[model samples]
Target: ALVELKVPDIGGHENVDIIAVEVNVGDTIAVDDTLITLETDKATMDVPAEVAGVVKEVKVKVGDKISEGGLIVVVEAEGTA
Candidate 1:
């Protein structure tokens, strides 16, 4: 199955910029692995995968400003190989 990974609403913060992406399309990752990092004026945080899977595509890039409901990445669920 295909899994959609979205940016979790972090305390209603808005206009957060993506500072880094730790994984790429086609990369396999485990649960809790860092997928990307977001930075606001006040702080930075890692966005982790909720499931182990192969990445399908990264929907955002570094320096892109994201909001509460932003598309971060998409993953093909584990065992779809």
Candidate 2:
């Protein structure tokens, strides 16, 4: 099945800058793998995956600002066709 991986809780931070994208389309990702690196006002954090799957689409790019619950990627889950 296809699943949407959105931005997870970031301690109420909004419009944070994405410093790097760790995964690309067609890449396989495991649970807890870094999807993107984000920089808030005080610190930088890596956004990890909650679901293991194959990357299908990357919705945000480097230099993009995203808040919590922002749609980040679309992935095809493992064990499905």
Candidate 3:
């Protein structure tokens, strides 16, 4: 199955700027692995994986604005391959 990785609650912050994307399409990642980095007004944050999967698509990029529920990447779950 394809799992969508989204921005989880970042203390209710919105429109946070994406500063970096740490994972790319086809990359394998584990839970809690940093997937992207975000910059809010007061802090820089790492968006981590909530599941272990192989990335199939990158939905956002550097300089994009993201909020809670924003799609980050799409991944194929571990057993799907």
**What digit string (tens of lDDT, one per residue) describes model 2 on residues 1-81?**
777887645544788777778767888877777787777677776677766778888876787888877778888777454
What lDDT score belongs to each candidate, Candidate 1 first?
A: 0.72, 0.74, 0.75
Model 1: residues with Cα > 4 Å off, grouped in runs: 8-12
Query: What is the C-alpha lDDT profile of model 1 across 2-32, one tens digit per residue?
Result: 6777764444487777777776688887778
Better of 2 and 3 by TM-score: 3
On residues 1-81, what C-alpha lDDT tens digit does candidate 3 reach at each position? 668888755544788777777766988877777787777677677677877778877877787788977778888776455
Q: Could you tally the backbone clashes for each prediction? A: 0, 0, 0
lDDT of 1 at 47: 73
User: Which parts of model 3 have CA positions greater than 4 angstroms off?
Assistant: 8-12
Please give the RMSD of candidate 1 to the true structure: 2.0
Top-TM-score candidate index: 1
- Candidate 1 — what's its lDDT? 0.72
Q: After superposition, how far is residue 49 of candidate 3 from its true place, in Å?
A: 1.0
| CA shift of 71, model 1, Å | 1.6
Give TM-scores for every candidate, taking all chains together and pairing residue i with residue i.
0.78, 0.76, 0.77
